[PDB]
């Protein structure tokens, strides 16, 4: 959170009090046909578009938007690292107790176990690189759902709009029943372009951004564990891995 | 399995969108000029494609509905890690475990070149070139549905412009226009619908099942390079359990 | 043939989808509202390309109909395997293998030089450069037709808005609105017909025939470098059978 729901309520109130200042007051906004067309069509087009192994991740993704990524931001890895090399120097790499403190991290623990069982300096590198590559493949597969939902939503806006144009032209065309119908039967492209471009394309974007943040976190985990494997100098680990966080937090290394 | 539910849901969404707004849906079913979308779309894809339009299209249009009951990754780990043990029992000759192997020749050539084939790098070369050629063939498959989705709404609104130049070439006092210009917009509805909710997601699902097939066959290459080297079941699961989600990685604890 | 049976279907689709709803055909006959489109896309494509308009526009407009009577992949196996068996008999001195090879010149510069030239890391690279140059030359004409497909509907939009300007300004003399609004209608009809049923699928046809030629010439590459060693000519029949589809792959059993 801290950016998702604030922006979502900001976009909904932007639409609402940008519409009630101008015009209609949600009266011709909940006529349950164009809403039904865009929402049932968007969910139908994404379940056609995606297999059943990937459409069984819509609530998992749709809440991992909002569940914040509180797992080891890079600046607290420096006290978490930079002492294992002292553990790999005072008693060596034979610290069998080293993999028990890995209380919240995905593949630190098995990575440290396959680090301490044997010297595997290139083996850990390509194992963890294939790990983060498969994870980014899975998150590209994740963000593709919201990407293609954002593609198919405004097309369904045009679809509901031309359904309504058929309904409005072939109707009482004297003075107002053309106009009231063609007013009411145009909210399809409003609610279709709003859901496509202001909801599901920034949601796909935010899945991409969080995937890139997590991949940078996995890469600095890779460089940290392949620094603390062979027992580097603990004073130059900060020289190695502080580059991923900006100078605004590199100059906060003055405590 | 999931494309069936979607086609039924898309058609009922369309039909309730008809009957709520006021479309009769019987006149939309019979304007009789729906060849501009159907025969027009198949004409545009026959101009667009060589002789792979009756000789290739229904053959994978029934792969669009065929369930992938071909060796899912969740059960694929105990298919290996016994073969890798069995290579480390008498040598790299025992092909007697490669007898059931009902998926593909991709396991046949891989395992039968791992045994009695004296090749290590020649394995991954031909396996990766085979999966790249299969990927290119499925690109050639999905391109048909992609292109039909691109040309369908344009030919539908081409039906609309023919309908409106037919309608405005009339006496046109009050009621013939209106009705005929609505019958003109029946064509652009079919172009939008059949082509946005069908052919772009059919192309998309061919792309996604292509990604699934490439994933399920790139994960088999470590299964062939494993039994070629004669590995151990402490290494296989630390090498290829990454190609299945975290929700199913902890379920491999029994 | 597949180019022809689609073009006649698209033109007859336009024609009968008009004549079952339209009344005259004199709307788009001669307004010279097509002069924005027909001269417009040809003006844009002759600005867009450096003297490939009298050189290569009708030349590969002709190859869009040439049914390729080149040796498809399923008869390369009784072509290359017995030639590799000949190379296993006597060596690379088979000068009697290319004198009957009255075919495309892609074959002679790999076959005839096999008696007086190294070919493993040499002819593979030369054939790869030659097929990349072929891909660039067909990319030129494919690019010509993609660009015609991108400037054509925008010129239809342009002729439409010329008709709009002439519509609501040149006004209030109502029996003058024919060649403004019907001009715009025929303008957008030409834009979305000539270009979407024509120049995008012509571009796609050039791209697909070029990729058929790419796959055909690359399996010719693997064949001609298989001739250089004659690597047990039935072993040759697995490294190239993946290019022909899985339909005609189980047919290959004799």
């Amino acid at each position: 959170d801290k950016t998702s729901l604030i922006g979502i309520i900001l976009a909904f109130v932007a639409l609402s009090v940008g519409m009630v200042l101008k015009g209609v007051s949600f009266s011709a906004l909940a006529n349950p046909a164009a809403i039904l067309i865009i929402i049932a069509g968007t969910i139908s087009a994404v379940v056609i578009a995606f297999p059943t192994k990937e459409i069984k991740k819509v609530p998992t993704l749709f809440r991992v938007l909002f569940k914040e990524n509180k797992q080891l931001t890079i600046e607290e890895l420096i006290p978490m690292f930079s002492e294992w090399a002292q553990l790999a120097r005072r008693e060596g790499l034979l610290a069998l107790e080293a993999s028990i403190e890995d209380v919240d991290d995905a593949f630190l623990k098995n990575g440290l176990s396959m680090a301490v069982d044997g010297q595997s300096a290139e083996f850990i590198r390509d194992i963890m690189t294939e790990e983060v590559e498969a994870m980014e493949d899975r998150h590209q597969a994740g963000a593709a759902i919201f990407t293609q939902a954002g593609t198919y939503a405004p097309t369904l806006g045009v679809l509901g709009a031309v359904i309504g144009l058929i309904a409005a032209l072939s109707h009482m065309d004297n003075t107002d029943e053309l106009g009231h119908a063609i007013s009411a039967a145009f909210v399809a492209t409003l609610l279709g372009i709003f859901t496509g471009y202001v909801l599901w394309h920034p949601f796909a974007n935010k899945l991409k951004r969080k995937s890139k943040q997590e991949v940078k976190l996995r890469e600095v985990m890779i460089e940290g564990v392949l620094s603390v494997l062979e027992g580097q100098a603990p004073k130059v680990i900060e020289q190695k891995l502080l580059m991923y966080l900006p100078a605004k937090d590199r100059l906060k290394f003055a405590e | 399995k999931t494309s069936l539910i979607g086609i039924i849901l898309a058609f009922v969404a369309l039909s309730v969108g008809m009957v709520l707004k006021g479309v009769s849906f019987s006149a939309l079913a019979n304007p009789a000029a729906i060849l501009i979308i159907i025969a027009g779309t198949i004409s545009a894809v026959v101009i667009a494609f060589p002789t792979k339009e009756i000789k290739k299209v229904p053959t994978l249009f029934r792969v669009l509905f065929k369930e992938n009951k071909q060796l899912t990754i969740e059960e694929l780990i105990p298919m290996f890690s016994e073969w890798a043990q069995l290579a480390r029992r008498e040598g790299l000759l025992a092909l007697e475990a490669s007898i059931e192997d009902v998926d593909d020749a991709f396991l046949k050539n891989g395992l039968s070149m791992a045994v009695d084939g004296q090749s290590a790098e020649f394995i991954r070369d031909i396996m990766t070139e085979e999966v790249e050629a299969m990927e290119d063939r499925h690109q050639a498959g999905a391109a048909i549905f992609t292109q039909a989705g691109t040309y369908a709404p344009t030919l539908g609104v081409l039906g609309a412009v023919i309908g409106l130049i037919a309608a405005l070439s009339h006496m046109d006092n009050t009621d013939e226009l209106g009705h005929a210009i609505s019958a003109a917009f029946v064509a652009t509805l079919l172009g939008i619908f059949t082509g946005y909710v069908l052919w772009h997601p059919f192309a998309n699902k061919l792309k996604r099942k292509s990604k699934q097939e490439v994933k399920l066959r790139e994960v088999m290459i470590e299964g062939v390079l494993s039994v070629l080297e004669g590995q151990a079941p402490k290494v296989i699961e630390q090498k290829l359990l990454m190609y299945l989600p975290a929700k199913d990685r902890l379920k491999f604890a029994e | 043939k597949t180019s022809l049976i689609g073009i006649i279907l698209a033109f007859v689709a336009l024609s009968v989808g008009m004549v079952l709803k339209g009344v005259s055909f004199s709307a788009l006959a001669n307004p010279a509202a097509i002069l924005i489109i027909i001269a417009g896309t040809i003006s844009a494509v002759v600005i867009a390309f450096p003297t490939k308009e009298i050189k290569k526009v009708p030349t590969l407009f002709r190859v869009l109909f040439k049914e390729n009577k080149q040796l498809t992949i399923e008869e390369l196996i009784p072509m290359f395997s017995e030639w590799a068996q000949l190379a296993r008999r006597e060596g690379l001195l088979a000068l009697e293998a290319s004198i009957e090879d009255v075919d495309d010149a892609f074959l002679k510069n790999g076959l005839s030089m096999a008696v007086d030239g190294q070919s493993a890391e040499f002819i593979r690279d030369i054939m790869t450069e030659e097929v990349e140059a072929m891909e660039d030359r067909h990319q030129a004409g494919a690019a010509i037709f993609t660009q015609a497909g991108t400037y054509a509907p925008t010129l239809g939009v342009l002729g439409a808005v010329i008709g709009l300007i002439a519509a609501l300004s040149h006004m209030d003399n109502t029996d003058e609105l024919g060649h403004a609004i019907s001009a715009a209608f025929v303008a957008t009809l030409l834009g979305i017909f000539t270009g979407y049923v024509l120049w995008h699928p012509f571009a796609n046809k050039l791209k697909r025939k070029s990729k058929q030629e790419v796959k055909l010439r690359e399996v010719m590459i693997e064949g001609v470098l298989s001739v250089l060693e004659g690597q047990a000519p039935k072993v040759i029949e697995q490294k190239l059978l993946m290019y022909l589809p899985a339909k005609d792959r189980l047919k290959f059993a004799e």
């Binding site: 405004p154 | 609309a160 405005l168 652009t188 | 709009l164 519509a167």
Partner: peptide, 25 residues
């Protein structure tokens, strides 16, 4: 990105010229 604006601009041109030719009084 998307490319659906091509039919959508067309139905807008068409219904535009429709209400142009109906605008006659």
């Amino acid at each position: 990105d998307e490319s659906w604006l091509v039919p959508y601009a067309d139905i807008l041109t068409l219904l535009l010229a429709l209400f142009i030719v109906l605008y006659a009084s």
